[PDB]
Amino acid sequence: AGEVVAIVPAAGSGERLAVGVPKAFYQLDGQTLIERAVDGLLDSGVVDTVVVAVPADRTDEARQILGHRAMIVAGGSNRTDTVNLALTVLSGTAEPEFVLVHDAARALTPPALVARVVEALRDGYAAVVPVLPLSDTIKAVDANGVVLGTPERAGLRAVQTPQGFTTDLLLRSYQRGSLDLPAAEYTDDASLVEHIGGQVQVVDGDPLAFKITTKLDLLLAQAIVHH
Amino acid sequence: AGEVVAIVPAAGSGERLAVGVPKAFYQLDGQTLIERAVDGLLDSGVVDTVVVAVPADRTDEARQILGHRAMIVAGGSNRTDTVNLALTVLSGTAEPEFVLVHDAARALTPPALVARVVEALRDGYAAVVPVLPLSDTIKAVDANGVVLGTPERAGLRAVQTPQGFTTDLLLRSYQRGSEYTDDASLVEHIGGQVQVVDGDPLAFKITTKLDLLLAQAIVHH
Numbered sequence A: 001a002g003e004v005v006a007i008v009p010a011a012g013s014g015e016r017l018a019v020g021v022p023k024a025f026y027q028l029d030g031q032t033l034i035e036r037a038v039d040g041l042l043d044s045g046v047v048d049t050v051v052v053a054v055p056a057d058r059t060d061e062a063r064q065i066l067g068h069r070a071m072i073v074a075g076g077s078n079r080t081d082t083v084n085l086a087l088t089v090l091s092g093t094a095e096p097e098f099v100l101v102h103d104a105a106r107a108l109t110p111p112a113l114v115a116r117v118v119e120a121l122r123d124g125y126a127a128v129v130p131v132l133p134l135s136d137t138i139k140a141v142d143a144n145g146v147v148l149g150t151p152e153r154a155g156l157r158a159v160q161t162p163q164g165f166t167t168d169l170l171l172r173s174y175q176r177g178s179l180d181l182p183a184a185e186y187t188d189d190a191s192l193v194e195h196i197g198g199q200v201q202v203v204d205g206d207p208l209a210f211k212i213t214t215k216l217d218l219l220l221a222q223a224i225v226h227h
Numbered sequence B: 001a002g003e004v005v006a007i008v009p010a011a012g013s014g015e016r017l018a019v020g021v022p023k024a025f026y027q028l029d030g031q032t033l034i035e036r037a038v039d040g041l042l043d044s045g046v047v048d049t050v051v052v053a054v055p056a057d058r059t060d061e062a063r064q065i066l067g068h069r070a071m072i073v074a075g076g077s078n079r080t081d082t083v084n085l086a087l088t089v090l091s092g093t094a095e096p097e098f099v100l101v102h103d104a105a106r107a108l109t110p111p112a113l114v115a116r117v118v119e120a121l122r123d124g125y126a127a128v129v130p131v132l133p134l135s136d137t138i139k140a141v142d143a144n145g146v147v148l149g150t151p152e153r154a155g156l157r158a159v160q161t162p163q164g165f166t167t168d169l170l171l172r173s174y175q176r177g178s179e180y181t182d183d184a185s186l187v188e189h190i191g192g193q194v195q196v197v198d199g200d201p202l203a204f205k206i207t208t209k210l211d212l213l214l215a216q217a218i219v220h221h
């Protein structure tokens, strides 16, 4: 009731980064990505509690790293499962008014970004997403590699995290709101809210909140923090 | 007739990079971006000629930098005008079978990427575009910041250069062409069929200081 709780999905293994360790636990200039992501949230001064979802076998390590500044839970076999499992913790009697979902991969997210997202929830917006103008040309491509069209670019945005929701809205969306289809039902949380007719609002993202995915992303991160 | 000619738009001033010099002529670890771009094309071993379009007042400088490994032309006031002006050079009697258009900004493009694009033109594809998966989800947004919808990201790609075309197809497209962002767009406008090949993360466009930093990091070791 005024209170902001942040869910941090960090239960992925980071296939495309290929760094011997599951991505979130990769060390970058001393601090692991999970630690950086968590610090990023707390330093906004507007996050009351962090729930971090990590791989089942890394429960202890996470606790050692983060100490008292985040609750630990085991993640699932895809991002949706993980956010679902984390949502369990935020149930009944004493549920917070607001939830943030924040990718651990976006480990250089400025606290200023978190602040803006929360500011928008406090203004009455049920769902909030940080966004950036498009940098490359985007083409819709079918399954053969054939271009189906070049989407008109002005009404398009690249979306980031943390995404903010009123808890009850996010909860509905994940629960049965997943009628849908079999497994991994999306990396993007606002999608689920849209599936059930929720209205998602947009705020300025930040280039620093990019998702560390490939070695090339890692290099930019190293460059950003070593300076 | 078998031959590949590459057009390199480099006539932009690079507003968003703000480096005192027009972007293409920015030095990165000794070599300018235009030189890097050009070398990237030649080293593929499958580009026969390079046409570089630079700002009208940098014609000489370009020539000094590049020497004998690229023809120089003045560019126009936007990217389309520039590609249009460059296309003039590739006209009648002895036109090449294939054209590549390659942003000078994408200065770390691996020669392997160029080779793949050309390989696809040699396989019979009229138009070819190198692509990457998207990191961020794309959403449609109204003028107030209200999300209107989220297209299926798996049916969406981020497009790079060099883009390859059969010359006659590209020529029609520009000479029919209603900025325009992207060369394949024009081919699509007139119903041409664009094929896709794997891009490469190294072929990113240097746009902002943040892009520059990654580039510096990539070339320094």
Ligand SMILES: Nc1ccn([C@@H]2O[C@H](COP(=O)(O)OP(=O)(O)OP(=O)(O)O)[C@@H](O)[C@H]2O)c(=O)n1
Residues within 6 Å of the ligand: A008, A009, A010, A011, A012, A013, A014, A015, A016, A017, A023, A024, A053, A075, A076, A077, A078, A079, A080, A082, A083, A103, A104, A105, A106, A187, A211, A212, A213
């Ligand atoms: N089953 C999963 C899969 C992903 N994530 C988290 O969601 C964020 C975004 O996912 P992504 O960047 O794809 O990370 P990975 O899934 O680990 O990477 P990859 O897809 O390359 O394996 C990451 O912090 C990741 O750890 C998660 O909590 N549980």
Ligand SMILES: Nc1ccn([C@@H]2O[C@H](COP(=O)(O)OP(=O)(O)OP(=O)(O)O)[C@@H](O)[C@H]2O)c(=O)n1
Residues within 6 Å of the ligand: B008, B009, B010, B011, B012, B013, B014, B015, B016, B017, B023, B024, B053, B075, B076, B077, B078, B079, B080, B082, B103, B104, B105, B106, B205, B206, B207
């Ligand atoms: N009138 C123009 C505009 C752009 N370009 C070229 O098109 C490529 C992509 O354009 P962009 O990345 O936008 O470069 P600039 O337009 O120079 O940068 P900015 O938009 O930041 O000014 C660049 O190699 C640029 O030099 C060009 O040849 N002629």
Ligand SMILES: [Mg+2]
Residues within 6 Å of the ligand: A012, A079
């Ligand atoms: Mg994943």
Ligand SMILES: [Mg+2]
Residues within 6 Å of the ligand: B012
């Ligand atoms: Mg431009």
